[PDB]
Each structure stands twice: as C-alpha cells, then as structure tokens.
Amino acid sequence: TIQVISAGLPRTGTKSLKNALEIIYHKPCYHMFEIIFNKQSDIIKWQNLIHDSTTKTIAIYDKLKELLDGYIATTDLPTCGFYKDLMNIYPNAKVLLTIRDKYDWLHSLRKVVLPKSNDPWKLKIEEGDKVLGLNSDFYKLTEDSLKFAFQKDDLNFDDDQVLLECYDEYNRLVQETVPSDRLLVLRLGDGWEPLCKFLNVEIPNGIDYPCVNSHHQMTQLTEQLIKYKSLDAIIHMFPDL
Ligand SMILES: OCc1ccc(NC[C@@]2(Cc3cccc(C(F)(F)F)c3)CCN(Cc3c[nH]c4ccccc34)C2)cc1N(O)O
Ligand SMILES: Nc1ncnc2c1ncn2[C@@H]1O[C@H](COP(=O)(O)O)[C@@H](OP(=O)(O)O)[C@H]1O
C-alpha cells in the first residue's frame, strides 16, 4: 500500500524519485511511464476519475485505491492533483514535493510533455507518440491532469506566463497544505541524504542518487522512435525504460 505520496509536477525529477523509492522499498512505484510502457488501459480510468472533482467521495476514493493497489508510491501526472485526497486515504503516508527553477521546469515541460501548438518540435513528439501507440485520449489525460493539479477549469496551454504562475502557485499551495512534518521539499541535486532521513532509512551504499529522464535523453528517444518506428528495435539504447 502507498507509503509515499509525491506531489511534484512533471519534469521536476519525478522519474529519478520513482527510481529512488523503488531502491528504498524494493516494491513498485506509479508514474506515467507505468501508464504508457506497461498499462495503456488505465488512461480512461484516470480521465473519468478526474472529472469527479458523501457517497461521491467514497466512490472516488475507492477508485483511487484500486488504481494504486500493489504500489508503494505515486509520482508524476495524473496523481499530482490528488495529493490531498491521498493524504486522507493513506493517513501515515509521507509527502514529497520535487521542485526546481521555474524557467528550467517550463523548458523541460515544453520539450517533453506539453509543447506549444506552433512549436515545430510538437510535430516530432506527435510522430513518436504514434510509434508508442498513444492517441488523443492520452493527450487529453495530460492536459486534464495538469488543469486538475492547477485547480483551473480554463487554461490556455500555449501561454507560458500562465504556466509559470500556475507552477509557482501550485508549489506554494502544496507547502501550505501538507502538514509540515509530513512534507519534504526536494530540490534537484539534493541527493539521498534529505530523502533517507525524512523516510528514516539508511542511505543506499555506494550508489548515486538517480539522474534519469533528461530532456536530452527524451529528445534522443523521440528522434530514434521517428527514425525506425519501432520501440522494440531501439529500447536497448534506453535502459531506464
Ligand atoms: O508523467 C510524465 C508524463 C506523463 C504524460 C506525458 N504525456 C506527454 C506526451 C503526450 C502528449 C500530451 C499532450 C500533448 C502532446 C502534444 F503536444 F505533443 F501533442 C503530447 C508527449 C510525449 N509522449 C511520450 C511520453 C514522454 N514522456 C512520457 C511519460 C509517460 C508516458 C508517455 C510519455 C507523451 C508526458 C510525461 N512526461 O513528463 O514525459
Ligand atoms: N539527479 C538529478 N540531478 C539533476 N537533474 C535531474 C536529476 N534527476 C532528474 N533530473 C532532471 O529532472 C527532469 C526530469 O523530471 P521528470 O522525471 O519529473 O520528467 C529532467 O530535467 P531536464 O529536462 O531539464 O533535463 C532531468 O534532467
């Protein structure tokens, strides 16, 4: 069952955290990679779960628990905006918030997750997405999960100023909302020490804190997917996946 709730937004180090939690607990962690490289069936389940935000709350909470059964932690979209509900469902779970410089975050988001509608790189991302078998339902899940995390009904995804404001507002509100001894804010570069002390575990012996999922590596993955049109053919070059 869930031991750690991760509230950090995509492109803040969530895959490195997922890897780190799996090293610490020796059990699997949710992350969107789980959805795309393992379980594309859960897309609609998240999308429908998102529209839901008393017998309404019990129905939502049971569907969250079923989606997360078998995992010890959640990172990344679409679980982000549910961090408060997860605190209620799992009262002993600790909460992590991965953060970084807002401009670095926005660039990383634009290059990997949510390119502008007139960015030429969007064309490549979409071509690689088809090689992975991702359809418009996945795109709507990404957009709706971000809107849900930001608590916005209407969001112009092409507006960087609004995304930067939403980023700062989201990170501030997590730090206001999570009881303070229940929260650890992790900045990129912090390493094992703050995470292991917060979780009260020993630092893993002789291994660096994970450094995975860079935009440089995602750009290479997209380029290789577009070139050969086969994930099986290229997976050997991307051992993290
Ligand atoms: O939770 C991490 C996360 C969750 C979901 C997604 N979906 C983003 C993508 C789809 C998309 C959505 C909206 C607009 C567009 C656009 F604009 F291109 F049309 C594309 C763009 C790239 N595609 C492959 C992929 C990259 N990473 C992934 C992680 C997991 C699963 C797949 C991917 C998915 C990305 C990430 N990140 O952070 O990578
Ligand atoms: N240990 C680490 N040190 C520095 N940056 C790290 C890191 N682990 C992950 N990152 C950065 O976190 C981002 C990935 O976050 P996520 O896994 O949530 O999608 C990437 O930013 P860049 O796109 O700027 O390279 C990646 O380089």
Closest CA to 85 of 50, 125, 111, 114: 50
Q: CA 65, CA 89: separation in Å to the nearest integer?
A: 8
Apex CA 183: angle with CA 96 and CA 198, to 5°?
Answer: 80
> Which protein residue's CA is at the shortest distance from atom 9 of ligand 1?
113
Answer for the pair 171, 99: CB distance below 8 angstroms, yes or no.
yes
If you take atom 2 of ligand 1, which residue's CA is the nearest one? 32
Closest listed ligand to the CA of 138: 1
How many domains, the chain? 1
Q: How far apart are CA 63 and CA 47, in angstroms?
A: 12
| Pocket test residue of 142, 146, 215, 222 for ligand 1, highest count of atoms within 8 A of CB | 142
**Read out DSSP for 16-79?**
HHHHHHHHHHSS-EE-HHHHHHT-TTHHHHHHHHHTT--HHHHHHHHHHHHHHTT-SEE-STTT
Beta strands in 159-237 (DSSP E): 183-187
CB of 6 sitting under 6 A from ligand 2: no
Give the length of the chain.
241
Ligand 2 contact via 182 beta carbon (within 6 Å): no
Question: Resolution, in Å, please?
Answer: 1.3
In which domain, by residue range, is 188 found? Answer: 1-241
206 lines ligand 2 (CB under 6 A): no
CA atoms within 13 A on the CB side of 83: 30
Cis peptide before 78 (omega within 30 of 0): yes
